Design a protein around this ligand. Sequence first.
Ligand SMILES: C[C@@H](c1ccc(F)cc1)N1C(=O)C(C)(C)c2cnc(Nc3cccnc3)nc21
Length: 296
Amino acid sequence: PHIGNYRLLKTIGKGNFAKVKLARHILTGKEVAVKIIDKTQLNSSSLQKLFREVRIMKVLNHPNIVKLFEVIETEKTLYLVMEYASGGEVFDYLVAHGRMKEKEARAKFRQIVSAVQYCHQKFIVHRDLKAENLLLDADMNIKIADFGSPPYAAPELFQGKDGPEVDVWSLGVILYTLVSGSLPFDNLKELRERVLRGKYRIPFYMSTDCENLLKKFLILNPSKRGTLEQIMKDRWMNVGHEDDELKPYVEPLPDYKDPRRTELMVSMGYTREEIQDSLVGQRYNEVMATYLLLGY
Ligand SMILES: C[C@@H](c1ccc(F)cc1)N1C(=O)C(C)(C)c2cnc(Nc3cccnc3)nc21
């Protein structure tokens, strides 16, 4: 229970060679979730997908996407240190709470759309968004997990045809999933047909407002599906947010020279130059991890 700068606590998840353990950054006392991946047992394609994830995770900085703090690499094992989302799975919440009232769903959906679009600003497409890919933090805010399933697929994804247009369909599914508690389309062929028809069951409690937005997402033609920037201006998206309309994610400017954190770090034996080089170089080393975590 001591992998590098971290002290391992519980095991919030296990699986196929990859296992997530709740840990604590010893220098800052902060809580993190360490994704421990055994590369010896990983196949040809999954390693390519893993390295894609690590490369993406490094560029993103959205309050609704799980932050990466450190990358601890060994020959056989890879350790990815990410922010731990205390709330749990949105899936278990939809299971327990029953479903979400449009007001609650709106708050969480604004974040989902903002986060996904932010990836799109950077020409990054998730290609597979699911309600069991969505996490909740302490204050019940969405935290999109990782890039590491079929009812969430687009029509042309069956028709044999990969860009941002795909993520727009999946968000329609996600929105429906949140407000109703169920999947809009349901063996194969039965799912293939119902998704291709486009016709989904509209629940009795749904508003005209919410159904219009679903229509903006769930469009059969991939070429006729709206962008996330034009969908952000939708009425349902801004109900109780009249002055604060949803706009493409801000992205804060870099504060690589915080005096509070740098004095504490220089005290720890870190050189002022290595603190700067690690952040400018975006190395995600023990220096970078210590700095990002100190800012909490
Ligand atoms: C364990 C795993 C995860 C991710 C998405 C899920 F939908 C379920 C589990 N997982 C991860 O890989 C990473 C991003 C490191 C992560 C961070 N935080 C949490 N929190 C959590 C999940 C479930 C119950 N209580 C807490 N799970 C994480």
